[PDB]
Ligand binder design. Structure first.
Ligand SMILES: N[C@@H](CCSC[C@H]1O[C@H](O)[C@H](O)[C@@H]1O)C(=O)O
Ligand SMILES: N[C@@H](CCSC[C@H]1O[C@H](O)[C@H](O)[C@@H]1O)C(=O)O
Ligand SMILES: Nc1ncnc2[nH]cnc12
Ligand SMILES: Nc1ncnc2[nH]cnc12
Lengths: 231, 231
């Protein structure tokens, strides 16, 4: 058999298209409040789950994928808010680095985003990111490679947008990427975080999110499947 | 053998007194960026670790304790900031409920602290909390039983204090309790979160924290050991 691949989304809506697109039989396995969908695709074992929203949920689920299911790589798919003009609704990006944008130990003179015995930016797999870029070029689609800021707030203001851009030079904002990538780094598991834009993280982001969740989730899922087809 | 007990702190300073007070031989086992100290005490296996600071770190470590080490209960010990007048420096409390105070999905009209498919407040073990209160009464020490607010910021302002009290009726603030308790709930593992006050979460909290970290960490550790002696 090939590698075992963990495939993660945050919301059920982000994994529904994944399960459908792979099209194989899945066994449902409950653990730690999550349901893991276990299947075989192109002689690879795939484990698919949605974590539920936010850093604690996604940390837990990623740790379970690694410790309980023994996945050898983790691919994340879902939606995100755009922080840069060149990322429009439906556009894709892969995260070259991620940060937890809501971490604040400034009382002890630490840079924002920094925790002692850790680092501001978390790295993802250069190999998987390069693969994504090659596939995007072949398919003639744009693919941004940039910084993703993750936090436990849904961002919907110009003020917070300006902070994420100024402080971290982030291209998109979401609520799980940094934590998924962090867990993978700690266990030496290659990680790729893929997102499709659903909104502009501004005052109208809630309504945009609702309008575009289904399409953007599908766009990311279809691209993730394209990557697995090359693995 | 009795139960297997996981014992968790956030910082090395919070577990140093734990290792010393138990006084037994520990085997050091690395996993996921943490070092787990495995020992035998009063015919119980104890697994001691510090997670590192914050929600992602503590979620990961608690999940590892459960999935990799098979702990049957988790006791947390460390320091916290006081939000109520009757909790003074060095005073102890156990968390009856915890909340992630920095969670904000208000863009979708959710109450602060709420995430879909979860709950605002996380419960801890009534049995362990009752045990703590009984021990405190016997030792003639005060022990508050209240709400702990956890987030990824070190709180050091009157404004944020007023929010935690008004929104959640929290008695103390820290950076790991809610996430540790959350993981334990998801896996059906009894949890007790114990904290000793190190500061008042106000403008001077940084300096107070530095002054009292050692003593407050020891106070919590000594009390945690008192509980294990009854288990
Ligand atoms: N409208 C939903 C909340 C979406 S929070 C934004 C999510 O989308 C992206 O995957 C982020 O990382 C979060 O998981 C609800 O009200 O249930
Ligand atoms: N002065 C330290 C940062 C302490 S953050 C407060 C910690 O204490 C309590 O355990 C909280 O939950 C956090 O873990 C440093 O600068 O490394
Ligand atoms: N604006 C936003 N903030 C946080 N997570 C998001 N996911 C999609 N859009 C988001
Ligand atoms: N004021 C504070 N805020 C967050 N975590 C803490 N731990 C101890 N004091 C704290």
């Amino acid at each position: 058999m090939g590698q075992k691949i963990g495939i993660l989304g945050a919301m059920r809506e982000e994994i529904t298209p994944i399960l459908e697109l792979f099209g194989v039989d899945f066994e449902e396995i409950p653990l730690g409040g999550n349901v893991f969908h276990k299947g075989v695709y192109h002689n690879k074992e795939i484990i698919v789950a949605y974590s539920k929203i936010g850093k604690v949920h996604s940390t837990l689920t990623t740790t379970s994928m690694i410790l309980a299911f023994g996945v050898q790589k983790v691919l994340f798919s879902g939606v995100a808010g755009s922080l840069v003009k060149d990322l429009k609704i439906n556009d894709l990006l892969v995260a070259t680095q991620l940060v937890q944008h809501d971490v604040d130990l400034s009382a002890f003179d630490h840079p924002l985003g920094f925790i002692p015995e850790s680092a501001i930016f978390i790295e993802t797999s250069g190999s998987l990111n390069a693969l994504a870029k090659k596939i995007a070029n072949e398919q003639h689609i744009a693919l941004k490679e940039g910084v993703i800021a993750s936090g436990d707030q849904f961002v919907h203001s110009k003020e917070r947008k300006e902070f994420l851009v100024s402080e971290f030079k982030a291209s998109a904002v979401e609520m799980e990427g940094a934590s998924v990538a962090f867990v993978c780094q700690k266990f030496g598991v290659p990680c790729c975080v893929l997102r499709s834009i659903s909104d502009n993280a501004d005052e109208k982001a809630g309504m945009s999110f609702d309008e575009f969740l289904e399409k953007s989730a599908h766009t990311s899922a279809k691209f993730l499947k394209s990557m697995v087809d090359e693995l």
